[PDB]
Amino acid sequence: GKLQDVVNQNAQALNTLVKQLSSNFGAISSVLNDILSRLDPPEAEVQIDRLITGRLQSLQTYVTQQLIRAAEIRASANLAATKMSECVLGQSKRVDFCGKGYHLMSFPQSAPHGVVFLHVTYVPAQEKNFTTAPAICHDGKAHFPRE
């Protein structure tokens, strides 16, 4: 779904830009050639300037939204480059950076506009209760475990 969202948002932005060409923005018609077929240049200029203003506004709105989306996908790609070098080319001690559990190794697969990581972890399973102590006294001396 994260990869399908990127395809959907961009197809939707292009479809909105195409559909804004049927707005007249206060002119007599949205069709430039129908304005040119009915009017002479000194008062056809009044209609064509309205159409020009509306279409320039539509394009500038599209380009601003593209710059903000591009900044978000640049941060996602920086994170994926860090995960490639820290989980596929090494073993990582950062908690939850390369899966859930204790990280052993990771494998990359390619996807359309993206990357899938397969993380292999160690998860402890079947626990028992025990009695425990911090130290052990033998001959007036305290003994601590080495590991």
């Binding site: 040119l36 993206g114 425990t132």
Partner: protein
């Protein structure tokens, strides 16, 4: 698809339509203005005050016998709906070709030496020719030819000093290039148009800020409060609920404004009470649905509205009967996000499916129905802590999970000239 959608907004329509004009019945002296026996010359224009009467402009502009009738900050159609402030009438006689110069921002020497309109002029200019009443050889209409400067707007200059036009003075004497500043119109019944006399009346007023005495022939109505009505207070149209107020207006004030430049307080013209004005009930509607692949059942959330004020907020019986499945009933439930209608409130807790807000979610469960519940955070658990026990694991599990990340997006370009202009060289 399954989700929750903002779709439109609800808005209760007004119930009555009131009009509140001052109780007055006198008629305005427009016969004494238009049907005067002798008008004034243009360098000495006559200014008459009009006050405290009922004016019916439609008689004037419909039953015209007029040639020019131009209204400037106002339309002639609306003139019988407004009330007016500081109404004045100017009146003079000029030549036919010089009717052109009585307009905002215009040259000539009627407009420059005799009578100047301002640029922010509100009012009307009325003209009609008068050759039957202003003929023979008539030499009783003077105008000025030479001044030193240009006049200000609404400034009258009546003084005949000898215009010095050389370098040497002329002390009360007509002499070398020293002229008498007024020269008479040479009217005859034998001229062509452009030299025949015209009679001109200029009305001028302010609109909609101050208390008013002059207005139009429409009848007042009762004052209805605590309901949504369509009011009119001396020309100020609007919509809302009216309520008694504690604002003390000073006597030169009639309206009050907000920070959005919105009229929120008004003084009644007949009673002298101060009322406050507030719009009707409104809000957003959200529609909770499963997929249309699944059902055609919906629940509706009226956002931050109390549940007993909904059949006021949407109107009861101005909409279709298929909007009154979703206005009262038994599936009516009050959340902190507003009022929810059409869902059954259960007492369990689940993982969230369709979020509503402030802890409430919704799902399509069991036949089938739509339910609303408080969501659960997770399974309750407890640790067996003591000061000398430990738990050690005896086995393990090898786990494999996935993580998906976006890397790149689609590269696009636009050809600006083909988007904006197509293949038009003028564009």
């Amino acid at each position: 698809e399954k989700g929750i959608y903002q779709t439109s907004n609800f808005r209760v329509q007004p119930t009555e339509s009131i009009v509140r004009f001052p109780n007055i019945t006198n008629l305005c002296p427009f016969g004494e203005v238009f049907n005067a026996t002798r008008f004034a010359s243009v360098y000495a224009w006559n200014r008459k005050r009009i006050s405290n009467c009922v004016a019916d402009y439609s008689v004037l502009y419909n039953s015209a016998s007029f040639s020019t009738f131009k209204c400037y900050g106002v339309s002639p159609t609306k003139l019988n709906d407004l009330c007016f402030t500081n109404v004045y009438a100017d009146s003079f006689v000029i030549r036919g070709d010089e009717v052109r110069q009585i307009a905002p921002g215009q040259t000539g020497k009627i407009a420059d030496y005799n009578y100047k309109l301002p640029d922010d002029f509100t009012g009307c200019v009325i003209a009609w020719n008068s050759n039957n009443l202003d003929s023979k050889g008539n030499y009783n209409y003077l105008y000025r030819l030479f001044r030193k400067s240009n006049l200000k707007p609404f400034e009258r200059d009546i003084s005949t000093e000898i215009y010095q036009a050389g370098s040497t003075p002329c002390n009360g004497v007509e002499g070398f290039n020293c002229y008498f500043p007024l020269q008479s119109y040479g009217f005859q019944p034998t001229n062509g148009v452009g030299y025949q006399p015209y009679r001109v009346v200029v009305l001028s007023f302010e609109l909609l800020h101050a208390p008013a005495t002059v207005c139009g022939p429409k009848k007042s109505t009762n004052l209805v409060k605590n309901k949504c009505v369509n009011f009119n207070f001396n020309g100020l149209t609007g919509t809302g609920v009216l309520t008694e107020s504690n604002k003390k207006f000073l006597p030169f004030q009639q309206f009050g404004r907000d920070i959005a430049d919105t009229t929120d307080a008004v003084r009644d013209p007949q009673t002298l009470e101060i009322l406050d004005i507030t719009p009707c009930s409104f809000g957003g509607v959200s529609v909770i649905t499963p997929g249309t692949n699944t059902s055609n059942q919906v629940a509706v959330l009226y956002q931050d509205v109390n549940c007993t004020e909904v059949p006021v907020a949407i109107h009861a019986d101005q909409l279709t009967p298929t909007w009154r499945v979703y206005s009262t009933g038994s599936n009516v439930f009050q959340t902190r996000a507003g009022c929810l209608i059409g869902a059954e409130h259960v007492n369990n807790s689940y993982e969230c499916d369709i979020p509503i807000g402030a802890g409430i979610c919704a799902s399509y469960q069991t036949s089938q129905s739509i339910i609303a519940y408080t969501m659960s955070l997770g399974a309750e658990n407890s640790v067996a802590y003591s000061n000398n026990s430990i738990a050690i694991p005896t086995n393990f599990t090898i786990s494999v999970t996935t993580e998906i990340l976006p890397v790149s997006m689609t590269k696009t370009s636009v050809d600006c000239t083909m988007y904006i202009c197509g293949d038009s060289t003028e564009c």
